[PDB]
């Protein structure tokens, strides 16, 4: 009843959770493993492309 006569903003703060983790986890769960290993090839070939 005395909510107006308090300062409870510290008792209720916005969480520091990154929602991106929930997104990337759903991304890996849907993909297979050989595509995960392929991404290491896509990155490596991109490095050699920038090198040449």
């Amino acid at each position: 009843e005395e909510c107006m006569f308090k300062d409870t903003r510290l008792d209720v703060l916005p969480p520091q959770v990154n929602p991106l983790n929930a997104i990337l986890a759903q991304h890996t769960a849907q993909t297979p493993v050989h595509r995960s290993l392929e991404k290491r090839l896509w990155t490596e070939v991109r490095a050699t492309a920038v090198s040449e």
Partner: protein, 69 residues
């Protein structure tokens, strides 16, 4: 830094994974194996072309996100 043996390793791992795959997963992995064989026969030219396409997409994406250059 070698690329051909890494692609061979990827193809062999995909073949190993194909055994435990379901029907749709089996079809997708078969298409992937055909893609890898096409890369192998093309001497990594199609692979580098696809890499360049994706990198061009990314490199067009970056400068547009600079709202305050």
């Amino acid at each position: 830094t070698d690329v051909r043996p890494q692609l061979y390793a990827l193809q062999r791992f995909a073949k190993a994974q194909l055994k435990t795959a379901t029907e749709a997963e089996r079809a997708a992995i078969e298409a992937d194996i055909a893609r890898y064989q096409e890369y192998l026969d093309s001497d990594l030219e199609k692979l580098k072309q696809d890499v360049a396409e994706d990198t061009a997409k990314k490199q067009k994406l970056i400068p547009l996100l600079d709202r305050y250059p």
